[PDB]
Structure 1
């Protein structure tokens, strides 16, 4: 086989605190003894994922993450298993979820909204260029590294579209109610443009402090999405409002940035992004949130 480092094993690490608990996974900070490097190790119990029919999501996460090579994504460095567990060695995003910052500060100023929006747009341009739909983009899945650059995660519900068939639509029903696109609800398929709908909701949330479609329960949220039933608060940055209006469009072929709208060029050219230097965002110093 191709030359590669020795496969790792649990005894190669000292495990420390739990960083997160999921319904079928747990993430633990670990130090690799031989290097002193720190990883976030996602651990899944084989019996549990077998019983709860989660193996396809686990295999999907490994397959999609292994294809990514870009600074705005959590990195999958290695995987291994033992008799009871599967292990993913991921980069550790020390500053946690973007959602945490929205909640603490209430909403972002225009400079920070623009910067973080531009990072997300650049990450989506990369993903869509590889024919990958995220399908569950939301602030909880946009992590922040030590330098406050984004690290998008949660690829177990992502989809690699088939280049051989020029596949544009994916059929699995996945996502989170507040960010799900109208085409997934009504046509039961998603496309790359479904991520641009989620982007619109995220920009709105950064400025307004709440996602645009919101209610106590999921069904009520769905009813608002399909009617495009939302409003802006009064002081919303005007160019950001124009951008959100060009993303939160019911017809998935009419969202700025989608292929039918001639792609990322026109989206990056939107007036909200006038000052952005798109070429090397990950090398730029992020603006301070407070």
Structure 2
């Protein structure tokens, strides 16, 4: 297949804006397909010493082959810019719906938590750690299944993710692992049910204090079995988090009672519960 050029597309609105990149909606002219095209300015990548990160992002995505991840269809470049042609998830970030519906009911929480768990199982199976897992990075496709994106900061088996989601070992050891993603998962479940991330404060530094102290609370309107799972994820000792290999992996995680009624085999063929 011949290399694609920007002229092959009618570019539209900006879908997303990062520190080092912008994502734009593009309809390919010959096929009429829409793609989310990530555009990186080379000069900028270089002056900020991000080449390894862009390289790492491209390499990971090429390796991923699973419905719960944003797919990479193509890349090309002109003299100033890199272009990554990516899945366009029509319903945008999970964060939106949290902010929109306020907080998920038990059924919706269970469904989307389970899809996220299944995605982590796959990713961790490939020896890849995301390291910046959070609702903004978890997108929803036209059928409201998740697609996890944003792999520039993954590690394949230094970097710190987003404050509310970083694990304690990041703040004390500076060396993460598969378990750091499970911590972030704990935070996301809590936020799904509570409407808000568990650790939060006036500024980043206060946030980090609450984390290493495990200073956080459960609302009373909090699904109990969901509460019990969260506590088995938000654990200072990374080797004691459910789902981590020192806890014998995703079997015990998926067998948690909160997931009692979940069919793990075909989640993406299942029909998600309406979000309201």
Deviations 1:14-50 (A, max 9, x none): 1111212222211111111121111011111111221
1:55 Cα deviation from its structure 2 partner? 1.9
CA distance in 1, matches of 2:219, 2:182: 21
1:181 Cα deviation from its structure 2 partner? 0.4
User: Structure 2 residue aligned with 1:191, among 174, 177, 182?
Assistant: 177
1:173 Cα deviation from its structure 2 partner? 2.4
Q: How many residues align?
A: 276
CA distance in 2, matches of 1:8, 1:233: 52
Determine if contact 2:153/2:159 at 8 Å carries over to the other structure: no
Deviations 1:194-220 (A, max 9, x none): 100000000000000110011121111
More deviation, 75-84/6-15: 6-15
Q: Give the TM-score, by structure 1 length.
A: 0.94
Deviations 1:88-132 (A, max 9, x none): 000001101101111111100000000000000000000000000
1:192 Cα deviation from its structure 2 partner? 0.2
Deviations 1:265-290 (A, max 9, x none): 01000000011000000000000012
Structure 1 runs (4+) greater than 4 angstroms displaced: none
1:244 matched to 2:244? The reply is no
CA distance in 2, matches of 1:272, 1:159: 30
More deviation, 109-118/213-222: 213-222
CA distance in 1, matches of 2:174, 2:271: 41
1:35 matched to 2:38? The reply is no
Q: 5+ residue gaps in structure 2? A: none
CA distance in 2, matches of 1:63, 1:247: 29
Q: Give the TM-score, by structure 2 length.
A: 0.98
Aligned 1:106-255 pairs, distance under 5 A: 106-161=102-157, 172-255=158-241
Q: CA RMSD in A?
A: 0.8
